[PDB]
RNA sequence: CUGCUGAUAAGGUCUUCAAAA
RNA sequence: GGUACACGAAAAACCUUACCUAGACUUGACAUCCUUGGCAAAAUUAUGGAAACAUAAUGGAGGUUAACCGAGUGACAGGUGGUGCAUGGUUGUCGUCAGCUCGUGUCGUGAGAUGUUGGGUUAAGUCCCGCAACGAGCGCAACCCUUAUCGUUAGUUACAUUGUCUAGCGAGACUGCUAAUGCAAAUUGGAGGAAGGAAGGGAUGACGUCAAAUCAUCAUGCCCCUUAUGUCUAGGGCUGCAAACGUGCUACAAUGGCCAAUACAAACAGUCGCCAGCUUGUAAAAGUGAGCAAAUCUGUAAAGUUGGUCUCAGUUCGGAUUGAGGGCUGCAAUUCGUCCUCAUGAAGUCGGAAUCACUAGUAAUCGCGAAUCAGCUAUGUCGCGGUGAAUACGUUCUCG
């Protein structure tokens, strides 16, 4: 069960606290970056592909 | 003829103003008595270390501005500032100051914490069984 | 714990059912799933069947149980005895 | 399997009595990185020494550390069963370090009141060759003298 | 002569640094080509955001990498501009990465 | 062991970003980050016969600009500009009719030394049941004849339909992967074979970048003319 | 410089190919 | 096992959720292809209802069907179902250790050898000599970021005790000079220098081993289900409990407990937010209410200093557990949130055999911030600063 959960997440619930943030590219529920709306394992791929502007590897 | 020095330590800047005076040095930090600014935990001798062995009878009026760090870092910063301002008065002190190495930035700063480690260098407990 | 200005809480479907069954003389068990509802004074005298998770356990409220939560008088997991591993 | 000898940091002279051993014992009684607290403990103990012995605190401290300061060390070397010990002459720096470490360890265990008085009385007792660090030094010295035979073989 | 815009405080910010310097260079060049007294292109502290992401798909949280995003920021305040400078400013075409926060 | 992505290690130092925009809020940052992914995935998975090397996306508050570098843009153009309108409507449906689209096709010069299209050709040959040794040998020899530095090709998976997975590598020329100054283009593709999935990863070395800067310059599109239109 | 120091269930992948470019 | 056990999970009350019980659905909650019309879907109000869903309402943006709203319709959708021993991708480990190979040549009937071994020097298969070998590739090093001194550019929202500070560019350190010895690489000492001989830290991780981990991020071969292993909802569960282990927090205390006054940070974050001030309250907080889209406003720094008190006791230590009254978030706090106040006051007085981490701003210790987040006994994770140690004689032993 993933397609139904994705569709239900897009659909608005009847309570405000019912709403949770899923990844927009994949459907992963846990470990989602609200700054980018993308889970960690897809954020890594996008950053390595250069899709997210300004996200360079950090050396500190 | 005033002298200006800029010292730094542990991310704590210092601006030391040396004024020629002959009515006691009267060291002063950030418009406050050093005995009240510092915990007076004898750290005063730390900043006077380069001004003791050579001289303070010359009664330099000290105007110190420090913004940042704790108190040991501030003391080290004003020590470096006093030395660097002293390099502007009779550069012959430069040799003696270099001899005991009070004219070099300490370069020691806190390391960055690393992931998977409980700190800069500490590591988690290791279990084998 | 629960705030004062908010007061107590009932789903109000249970409240409507309780009012109706109190006005009716021949009361019967009230099958409810609302374990979140607190036992209001008007509840006194009725009998409820609360969904423990599997079945509906019957609880008879009294003038004393007033205040607690309705599902607090029914359990959800059962444990009675371990077994020796070795 | 290191083939490198470690460097040594400066000991720093004490800014009150101008005796490096004072700074060393401050660092030894350091706990939780509290230089101020350690310095307060030491200077209060020295003032109590003034109040009691009526002599120079630095001289009393030197008389205590020199007397507690050991001569021989026994290094454990196991071959087949248990360990046979080996007496070796220690360097002066490690000698002083061991003396200070023993002084602090036996000072933080005595039955008395605040650690100020604890360490002060421990120092005054060790100044007269009667103390717990004295007993420790005596024990290691007697053990080395007993195991004097295996001194020739070290490794 | 008129001004119609006193104290035009242009604020620049971008994820990239060199593009920001180039855009500020073009801006100051145009505004000095017109008769306007630029206060100066000063820099402001760069807000750096760090995101830490576990490399592995399933386990080994210990092995994790890091990413950064810097919002480089510059300030530049013009005293009096007038139409003679505003019309020339209209044709600047700042690159997309640069962001303007004009405050009038 | 495991190696960091060659592109990801060099991004932000000697490589510019494929999408250049600044969003308004966190809500819009996700939508804009997903729409560009959809557009790029469209251009890559379908209309594959045109050898689209790379597509860059450039957005402002409301205007979308797409730069599609292709080796054979005649297939995108179609017969008297037919498929152009189809892909334009596809993009407009993807992003929204409220925005203004500025699609721009660009003929890429010296295509052969581009890892994306080399890997795509590799995957097509694998899927077409072409023998692997011959396929990799011909691809390597044509890449080298194109006049570049070393190229490293790694092809892993259920090799030739075997029940045990293997991997086959061909390096021919110097490929310094630890060096940051080197211009290394890396691409990865999946050949969907009747026996499963084959992963082809192509690293190509294209000299050393001796000019400091975040690119802002074309990368092997310049040897011939790079001027194709469809814009405004 | 010779203390002591014993054992580890069965069957198993993994090279398809050079004909050639 | 090392390479699992504060791990996936950077947030389990509902949702998450994949599990159980129950109430409901069938080209389906979602999608394409086809014959076909668009004059809807939402949302909300009624009744039945645990809610799913049903009967009635306002019949709705729009743009004539664009997207979507439908009818018919069979291919089918759907699966967090199995197989990580069919795979792609990604990752742990040996290990940031210094190795792994190739072309030509030569030796050997052959597997194979040479180069890669030998002597010096390094962290290094780093380099130099020797040498049937001559070269080359990946790895090492450097190029990348940051900290340490300085110059220049700019002076607001920094500074304004006038040159700090912030961020672009640049200079600087190159065994560059000197002495020793070596053929040469090079090693050691000195000078000047902020910095000296990989100046400190980070990113960077070769061929391959463990058929190592993941079909539950994603994709995918094959098998299996197709009015059910697919879908919606309500309740319960993932929080159980004679026990055992791992990782952490708090302690067993006068280097301390409590009370009062009080000084000094960096980094980061903020318009469903940060919340200054004021009023109320023993307090969590409530109301009013400015300021800030931020070098401007907000997010109380604590250890530390001084003073008062306790006077070595199971205590003014220790806070567990337990009863009561309140605050906030949320439809909803019983299973199962956290905070405050009042009251009670378990164990525990330094921990057996045996083990762990650490070589300077390190260990130890004290606070601050952020991510996921409506809320959360995260004491967890990722970062920042304040104070700030001890030791390294040596490789006999121990693991690799
Ligand atoms: Mg799925
Ligand atoms: Mg939630
Ligand atoms: Mg911890
Ligand atoms: Mg153990
Ligand atoms: Mg034995
Ligand atoms: Mg046997
Ligand atoms: Mg649930
Ligand atoms: Mg209509
Ligand atoms: Mg019509
Ligand atoms: Mg495996
Ligand atoms: Mg070898
Ligand atoms: Mg030989
Ligand atoms: Mg050789
Ligand atoms: Mg390197
Ligand atoms: Mg296995
Ligand atoms: Mg594992
Ligand atoms: Mg599956
Ligand atoms: Mg449910
Ligand atoms: Mg759990
Ligand atoms: Mg006290
Ligand atoms: Mg101000
Ligand atoms: Mg306040
Ligand atoms: Mg005090
Ligand atoms: Mg007791
Ligand atoms: Mg207490
Ligand atoms: Mg509760
Ligand atoms: Mg006691
Ligand atoms: Mg080390
Ligand atoms: Zn994702």
Tell me about this structure.
This is part of a larger assembly, with chains A (60 residues), B (129 residues), C (86 residues), D (155 residues), E (104 residues) and F (232 residues). Chain A is of the alpha+beta class. Chain A contains two helices and three strands; from the N terminus they run αββαβ. Chain A has one domain (1-60). Chain A is elongated. A three-stranded mixed sheet of chain C has the order 1-2-3, with helices on one face. The longest helix of chain C is centred in the N-terminal third of the chain and has 11 residues, at 13-23. Chain D has a single domain (20-152), classed as Ribosomal protein S7/S5 (Ribosomal Protein S7). In chain D, 54% of the residues lie in helices and 8% in strands. Chain D has helices at 20-29, 35-53, 57-68, 92-107, 115-126, 132-146, and strands at residues 72-77, 84-89. Chain D has a two-stranded antiparallel ribbon. In chain D, β1 (72-77) and β2 form a beta hairpin. In chain D, α1 packs across α2, α2 (35-53) packs across α5 (115-126) and α4 (92-107) crosses α5. The radius of gyration of chain D is 18 Å and the shape is globular. Chain D starts with 19 loop residues before the first helix and ends in a 9-residue tail after the last helix. Chain F has 232 residues and is α/β, with parallel strands linked by helices. Chain F has two domains: 16-109, no CATH class; 110-216, no CATH class. Chain F contains six helices and eight strands. Chain F has a four-stranded mixed sheet. In chain F, strands 6-5-8-7 form a four-stranded antiparallel sheet, with helices on one face. In chain F, β1, α2 (26-45) and β2 form a beta-alpha-beta unit. Chains in contact: A-E, A-F, B-D, B-E, E-F. At the A-E interface, α2 and β3 of A face β2 and β3 of E. The site of one magnesium ion (MG) has 2 residues of chain B, from loops. Chain B binds two RNA strands through β1, β2, β3 and α3.
Global geometry of chain C: globular
CATH-assigned homologous superfamily of chain D: Ribosomal protein S7/S5
Supply the CATH architecture of chain D: Orthogonal Bundle
- Beta percentage of chain D is 5-15%
Function (chain F): Binds the lower part of the 30S subunit head. Binds mRNA in the 70S ribosome, positioning it for translation.
Organism (chain F): Mycoplasma pneumoniae (strain ATCC 29342 / M129 / Subtype 1) (Mycoplasmoides pneumoniae)
Family (chain F): Belongs to the universal ribosomal protein uS3 family.
GO molecular function, one term (chain F): structural constituent of ribosome
């Amino acid at each position: 069960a993933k397609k139904s959960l994705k569709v239900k997440q897009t659909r608005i619930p009847k309570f405000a606290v019912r709403a949770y943030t899923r990844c927009q590219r994949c459907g992963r529920a846990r470990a989602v970056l609200s700054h980018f709306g993308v889970c960690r394992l897809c954020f890594r791929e996008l950053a390595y592909a250069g899709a997210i502007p300004g996200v360079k590897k950090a050396s500190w | 003829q005033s002298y200006y020095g800029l010292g730094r330590r542990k991310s704590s800047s210092a601006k030391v103003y040396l004024t020629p005076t002959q009515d006691k040095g009267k060291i002063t930090v950030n418009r406050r008595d050093p005995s009240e600014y510092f915990p007076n935990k004898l750290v005063i001798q730390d900043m006077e270390q380069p001004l003791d062995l050579t001289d303070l009878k010359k009664n330099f009026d000290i105007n110190v501005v420090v913004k940042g760090g704790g108190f040991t870092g501030q003391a080290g910063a004003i020590r470096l500032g006093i030395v660097r301002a002293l390099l502007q008065f009779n550069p012959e002190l430069k040799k003696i100051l270099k001899s005991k190495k009070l004219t070099t930035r300490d370069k020691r700063v806190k390391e960055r914490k690393k992931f998977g480690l409980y700190g800069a260098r500490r590591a988690p407990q290791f279990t084998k069984r | 714990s629960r705030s004062a200005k908010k007061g107590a809480f009932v789903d109000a479907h249970l409240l409507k059912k309780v009012i109706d069954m109190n006005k009716q003389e021949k009361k019967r068990p009230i099958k409810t799933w609302s374990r979140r509802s607190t036992i209001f004074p008007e509840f006194v005298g009725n009998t409820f069947a609360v969904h423990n998770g599997k079945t509906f356990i019957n609880v008879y409220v009294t003038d004393d149980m007033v205040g607690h939560k309705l599902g607090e008088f029914s359990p959800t997991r059962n444990f009675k005895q371990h077994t020796a591993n070795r | 399997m290191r083939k490198n000898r470690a460097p040594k940091r400066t000991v720093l002279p004490d800014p009150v009595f101008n005796n490096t051993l004072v700074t060393r014992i401050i660092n030894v009684i350091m706990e939780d990185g509290k230089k101020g607290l350690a310095q307060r403990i030491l200077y209060g103990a020295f003032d109590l020494i003034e109040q009691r012995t009526k002599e120079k605190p630095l001289t009393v401290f030197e008389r205590a550390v020199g007397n507690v300061m050991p001569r021989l060390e026994l290094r454990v070397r196991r071959i087949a069963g248990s360990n046979y010990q080996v007496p070796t002459e220690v360097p002066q720096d490690r000698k002083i370090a061991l003396a200070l470490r023993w002084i602090a360890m036996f000072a933080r265990k005595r039955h008395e009141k605040t650690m100020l008085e604890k360490i002060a009385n421990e120092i005054i007792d060790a100044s007269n060759n009667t103390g717990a660090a004295i007993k420790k030094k005596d024990d290691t010295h007697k053990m080395a003298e007993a195991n004097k035979a295996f001194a020739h073989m070290r490794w | 002569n008129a001004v119609k815009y006193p104290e035009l405080k242009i604020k620049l910010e971008s994820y990239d640094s060199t593009l920001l310097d180039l855009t500020t260079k073009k801006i100051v060049e145009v505004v000095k080509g017109v008769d306007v007294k630029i206060k100066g292109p000063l820099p402001l502290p760069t807000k750096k955001e760090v995101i830490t992401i576990i490399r592995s798909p399933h386990v080994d949280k210990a092995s994790r990498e890091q990413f950064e995003k810097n919002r480089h920021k510059r300030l530049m305040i013009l005293v009096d501009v007038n139409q003679g400078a505003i019309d020339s400013l209209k044709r600047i075409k700042i690159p997309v990465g640069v962001t303007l926060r004009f405050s009038k | 062991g495991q190696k960091v992505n060659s592109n990801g290690l060099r991004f932000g130092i000697n490589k510019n970003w494929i999408s250049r925009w600044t969003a308004n809020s966190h809500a819009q940052t996700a939508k804009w980050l997903i729409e560009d992914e959809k557009i790029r995935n469209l251009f890559f998975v379908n209309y594959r016969n045109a050898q689209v090397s790379n597509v860059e996306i450039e957005r402002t508050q409301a205007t979308v600009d797409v730069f599609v570098y292709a080796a054979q843009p005649a297939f995108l153009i179609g017969s008297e500009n037919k498929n152009i309108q189809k892909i334009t409507k596809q993009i407009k449906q993807i992003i929204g009719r409220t925005t203004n689209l500025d699609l721009t096709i660009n003929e890429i010069g010296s295509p052969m030394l581009s890892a994306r299209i080399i890997a795509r050709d590799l995957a097509n040959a694998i899927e077409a049941r072409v023998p692997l040794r011959t396929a990799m040998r011909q691809s390597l020899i044509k890449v080298l004849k194109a006049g570049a530095n070393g190229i490293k090709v790694l092809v892993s998976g259920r090799l030739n339909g075997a029940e045990i997975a293997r991997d086959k590598m061909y390096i021919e020329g110097n490929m310094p992967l630890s060096t940051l100054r080197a211009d290394i283009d890396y691409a990865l593709e999946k050949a969907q074979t009747t026996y499963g999935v084959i992963g082809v990863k192509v690293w190509i070395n294209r000299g050393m970048i001796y000019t400091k800067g975040l690119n802002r310059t074309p990368a092997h599109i310049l040897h011939p003319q790079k001027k194709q239109p469809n814009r405004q």
